Amino acid sequence: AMVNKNKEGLNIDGKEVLAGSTNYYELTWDLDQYKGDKSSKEAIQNGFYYVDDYPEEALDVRPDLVKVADEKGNQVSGVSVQQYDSLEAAPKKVQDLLKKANITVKGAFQLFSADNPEEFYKQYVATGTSLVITDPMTVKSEFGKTGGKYENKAYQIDFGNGYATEVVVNNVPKITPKKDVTVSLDPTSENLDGQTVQLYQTFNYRLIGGLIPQNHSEELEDYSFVDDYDQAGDQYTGNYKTFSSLNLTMKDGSVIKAGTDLTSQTTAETDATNGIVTVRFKEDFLQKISLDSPFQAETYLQMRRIAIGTFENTYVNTVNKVAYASNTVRTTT
Ligand SMILES: [Ca+2]
Ligand SMILES: [Ca+2]
Ligand SMILES: [Ca+2]
Ligand SMILES: [Ca+2]
């Protein structure tokens, strides 16, 4: 058996997992059927292992959180774990036992090993006592820029013979912030990217956040718009508005309609000297969004053009503290 969970313990098999989130896998090292086993010395000496072939393109193991526990919840001594970057890089002994167990891995994998096959056998195997491996891994930050499926595969090796235990699939959504230039808050208004802005004209930078899909695996804790604008040409006026980009369903079942003014659910921080403004969603609001709802929002920063010339803007949308850059807009004065 294999299941993926979030930190709070919810089953998240098949769910959308944001870059930066952790997959708290629980792998059952299933020894129940061996109660009253009568296998030979040589079969026992063939050993007991658990193999997790994790998808290293997408995930990094969190080695400090990896645990092997018995049925009382106590850590198991005499079991160790090593993570290898490939079969080729693995010790010869490891290559050989995988071959014998008839296990194929792709790229990087972990091997959990019974240090002393005879002691492990006497204690857990012949007694039919199953163990639970907690094996947390984090989605690579950069993967959020392309997104896509990943799957975790595991194998159990009993008496040197291996077999597949389970596969769990998840998907990483692609987070793609967008930046437009407007002279209106109407979402249908013309984009002035690539066009002219008059000297001392006010206008908006429209910062459209990335889309968090429904069926996501954990709470949203951060959704921010960080705009380091070019203060040689642009001045932030101190005014902004933030709107929902989609219909949101809250944990209480209420619905916030697309286009609703959510400015009061945000805070703002300015650095005029360095020409930066940051707008962040409040936890009080983010914690109310259903895990089964999408989330997306957009901020209109009111600017003033304050010099002749050509000026660019880019903003960064952070989503649970992973940064994603928007396109770069350009206007001329
Ligand atoms: Ca290693
Ligand atoms: Ca792998
Ligand atoms: Ca829209
Ligand atoms: Ca700046």
What features would you highlight for this structure?
binds calcium ion, 333 residues, Immunoglobulin-like, elongated, mainly beta, Agglutinin receptor
What does this structure look like?
This protein has two domains: 1-175, Immunoglobulin-like (Sandwich), CATH 2.60.40; 176-333, Immunoglobulin-like (Sandwich), CATH 2.60.40.740. The chain is built from four helices and 23 strands. It is elongated. It is 8% helix and 41% strand. The protein has helices at residues 41-45, 92-100, 117-125, 283-286; strands spanning 2-3, 22-29, 48-53, 59-61, 67-69, 79-84, 109-114, 131-139, 148-158, 161-172, 178-182, 202-208, 223-228, 234-244, 248-249, 255-256, 266-271, 276-281, 297-305, 310-313, 316-319, 322-325, 329-332. The longest helix has 9 residues, at 92-100. Strands 1, 2, 4, 5 and 8 form a five-stranded antiparallel beta sheet that branches. It has 333 residues and is mainly beta. The chain binds calcium ion (4 copies). Residues 228-231, 274-276 line the site of one calcium ion (CA). It is classed as cell adhesion.
